[PDB]
Amino acid sequence: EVKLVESGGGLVKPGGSLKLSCAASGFSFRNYGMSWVRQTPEKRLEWVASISYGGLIYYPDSIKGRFTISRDIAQNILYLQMSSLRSEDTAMYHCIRGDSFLVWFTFWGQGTLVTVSAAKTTAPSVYPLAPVCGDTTGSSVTLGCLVKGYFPEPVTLTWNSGSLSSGVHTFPAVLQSDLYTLSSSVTVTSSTWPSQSITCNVAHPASSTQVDKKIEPRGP
Amino acid sequence: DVLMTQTPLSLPVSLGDQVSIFCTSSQTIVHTNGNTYLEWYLQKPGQSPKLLIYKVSNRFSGVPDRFSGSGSGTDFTLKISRVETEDLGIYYCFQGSHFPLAFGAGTKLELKRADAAPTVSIFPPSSEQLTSGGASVVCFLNNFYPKDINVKWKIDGSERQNGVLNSWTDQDSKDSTYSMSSTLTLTKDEYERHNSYTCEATHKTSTSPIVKSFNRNEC
Numbered sequence: 556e557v558k559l560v561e562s563g564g565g566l567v568k569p570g571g572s573l574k575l576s577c578a579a580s581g582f583s584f585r586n587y588g589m590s591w592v593r594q595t596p597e598k599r600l601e602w603v604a605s606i607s608y609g610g611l612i613y614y615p616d617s618i619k620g621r622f623t624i625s626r627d628i629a630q631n632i633l634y635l636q637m638s639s640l641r642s643e644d645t646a647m648y649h650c651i652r653g654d655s656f657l658v659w660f661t662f663w664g665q666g667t668l669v670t671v672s673a674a675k676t677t678a679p680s681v682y683p684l685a686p687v688c689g690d691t692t693g694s695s696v697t698l699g700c701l702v703k704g705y706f707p708e709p710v711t712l713t714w715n716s717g718s719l720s721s722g723v724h725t726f727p728a729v730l731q732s733d734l735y736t737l738s739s740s741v742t743v744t745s746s747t748w749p750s751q752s753i754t755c756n757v758a759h760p761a762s763s764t765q766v767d768k769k770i771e772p773r774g775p
Numbered sequence: 776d777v778l779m780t781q782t783p784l785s786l787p788v789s790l791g792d793q794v795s796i797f798c799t800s801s802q803t804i805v806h807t808n809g810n811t812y813l814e815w816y817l818q819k820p821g822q823s824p825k826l827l828i829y830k831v832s833n834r835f836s837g838v839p840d841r842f843s844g845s846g847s848g849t850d851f852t853l854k855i856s857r858v859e860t861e862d863l864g865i866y867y868c869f870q871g872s873h874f875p876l877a878f879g880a881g882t883k884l885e886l887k888r889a890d891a892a893p894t895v896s897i898f899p900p901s902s903e904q905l906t907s908g909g910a911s912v913v914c915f916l917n918n919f920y921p922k923d924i925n926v927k928w929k930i931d932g933s934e935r936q937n938g939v940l941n942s943w944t945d946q947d948s949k950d951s952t953y954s955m956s957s958t959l960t961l962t963k964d965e966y967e968r969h970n971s972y973t974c975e976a977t978h979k980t981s982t983s984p985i986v987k988s989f990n991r992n993e994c
């Protein structure tokens with residue numbers, strides 16, 4: 556069974572260096588063309604580099620010079636040395652076996668995440684979002700939770716420890732200024748809240764953070 | 776350099792539909808060996824991209840018979856004769872005939888449903904954040920369809936189109952709608968400088984925006 560396993564991904568500061576490895580199985584490098592393709596946070600696919608079954612190397616001008624694909628044919632391991640790293644180099648890296656002059660990316664590896672940032676491990680700021688005096692005048696009531704300025708990703712958010720599942724919307728994090736911010740909303744019946752307890756449980760493993768915030772009605 | 780263009784960036788479909796996804800090259804993509812290396816990939820949520828079609832029209836082994844490929848010159852096309860629930864995800868085209876090898880932006884195959892007005896919820900800064908010295912006004916525009924929407928903020932009647940962070944959810948696997956969070960971030964002092972915070976939503980179901988507001992000092 557053909558296999559391609561990427562390793563080495565992780566957090567690296569700008570301008571820094573990192574080495575990615577790709578262990579192959581099921582085939583030999585002397586018979587297949589190898590490549591690295593990355594998917595940026597925006598979900599865009601970019602070709603990074605490729606080495607032919609013969610040794611021929613190819614790089615796109617943006618990567619040329621900064622990154623370096625090499626291969627250990629003996630130990631059937633593909634590599635990608637990264638340096639002169641920028642934040643745009645942040646993406647999931649996949650090594651791929653292709654068929655020379657037939658198909659470029661026939662078999663993909665699951666990938667390894669490389670994150671380039673100067674940010675430091677920062678526990679999140681978890682704030683309880685209570686509704687304004689207006690909204691609450693109806694059948695349902697939407698609550699919320701603001702998880703601001705945390706690093707790195709990811710954090711885990713639940714409502715009432717998971718007890719509150721249906722009618723939830725946890726939004727994708729976004730960098731505000733080198734720090735991640737995320738938000739979740741939970742809609743429930745008017746007689747469900749505030750009558751019944753509703754809590755936003757957020758955890759940020761990297762900083763050994765496990766906070767809980769109960770949503771209380773506003774007002775004087 | 777050959778740039779690959781994909782449209783639409785989002786194709787709403789109903790299951791059982793015969794669909795055609797298009798991809799164009801900025802110029803011809805014929806390798807010096809006569810072959811056209813145009814490939815199509817399907818990235819299924821959570822997984823990595825997988826080969827569907829290679830060299831314009833060759834279906835890769837193991838790929839369903841409902842997928843086909845065609846094209847010539849600068850126009851290439853991916854066909855799915857009858858869509859299933861497994862075919863939903865993003866489709867990428869790619870040309871490897873010339874260097875640098877180019878990927879298309881991708882086309883997201885999504886599900887069509889009945890229009891749904893968004894539920895707009897506005898939330899003033901938490902009493903807690905205020906003590907830390909900050910003020911983030913969040914606003915949720917939930918379960919709406921189609922996915923196209925405009926969120927406008929107005930602090931004291933005056934539009935504040937600066938310093939706003941927006942995030943969108945992927946189509947709901949259950950009801951098939953979309954939701955979005957829009958967080959305006961100010962400072963305790965700047966926030967205390969205004970009274971009226973407003974969140975307006977322009978959905979093709981309103982034109983005359985869905986408005987939710989509050990006054991710092993009162994409601």
Ligand SMILES: Cc1c2ccccc2c(CCC(=O)O)c2ccccc12
Nearest residue numbers: 588606607653654655656657658659
């Ligand atoms: C997969 C793959 C190819 C797949 C399809 C067509 C050509 C490929 C080439 C060589 C491309 C060239 O010389 O222009 C490769 C060269 C090096 C490594 C892989 C390659």
